[PDB]
């Protein structure tokens, strides 16, 4: 996953940063709603948005 | 480089189970090692309304020190120490006194 993204284009990289935060908003709504018994996807998605914003700001320069 | 690992049939060298043989269940962080069926204690487990509301005198196994166990050789029949050699580019646990790989 950290390696599969370094064959993506920048616009490909950016549209999955949009899907990650929409997933992150989906999970953050679910955790407060009494749902999301799988309370480990939060830490995983938060480090998935960091994984791509790192890969964003490195091919930008 | 640990000498005592996840699933090793070990023997206890010290402390009320001196001579008894069991298998390691999990190596903890602080040099304490759970051995299967060896270091049994008697936990007066208090029943909480949920979460195993059976609240008997639960008999679990306590952690033993990792230096108080040694790996059972079973090809000599005795307790035995561990060394580290490199075979095939891999760090290999091997028994002392016969030098053979574990």
């Amino acid at each position: 996953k950290a390696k599969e993204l370094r064959e993506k284009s920048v616009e490909e990289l950016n549209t999955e940063l949009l899907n990650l935060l929409r997933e992150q908003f989906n999970l953050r709504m679910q955790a407060a709603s009494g749902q999301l018994q799988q309370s480990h996807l939060l830490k995983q998605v938060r480090r998935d948005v960091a994984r791509v914003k790192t890969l964003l700001n490195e091919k930008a320069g | 480089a640990a000498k005592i690992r996840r699933d090793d049939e070990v023997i206890v060298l010290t402390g009320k189970d001196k001579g008894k043989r069991g298998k390691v269940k999990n190596v903890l962080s602080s040099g304490k090692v759970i051995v299967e069926g060896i270091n049994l204690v008697k936990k007066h487990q208090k029943p909480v309304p949920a979460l195993n509301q059976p609240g008997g005198i639960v008999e679990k196994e306590a952690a033993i020190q990792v230096s108080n166990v040694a790996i059972f050789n079973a090809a000599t029949g005795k307790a035995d120490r561990v060394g580290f050699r490199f075979e095939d580019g891999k760090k290999v646990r091997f028994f002392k006194s016969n030098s053979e790989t574990i």
Partner: protein, 93 residues
């Protein structure tokens, strides 16, 4: 007009109170815990885009963190911002 990834970070949590549920049944008002730097325009833009509903007026307030004594020390909870988003006539979530 707000950037989309900014709107995905303001709506923290839907707030349940039995005052908040009175507002949901009687004045069509969802009460949300929002981010601390949320403006009333950013909440209005985020409830409409992400909850797919219509919004008349967001009223906000900032809840002060309670001082609690866990164990023997003196801690303080975080201040949080609380919106009162009044939807117009059609209620989804």
């Amino acid at each position: 007009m707000i950037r989309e990834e900014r709107l995905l970070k303001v709506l923290r949590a839907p707030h349940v109170s039995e005052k908040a549920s009175t507002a949901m049944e009687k004045s069509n008002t969802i009460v949300l815990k929002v981010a601390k730097d949320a403006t009333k325009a950013e909440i209005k833009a985020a409830v409409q885009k992400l909850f797919e509903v219509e919004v008349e007026v967001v009223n906000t307030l900032v809840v002060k963190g309670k001082v609690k004594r866990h164990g023997q020390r003196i801690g303080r909870r975080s201040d949080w911002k609380k919106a009162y988003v009044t939807l117009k006539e059609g209620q989804n979530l």
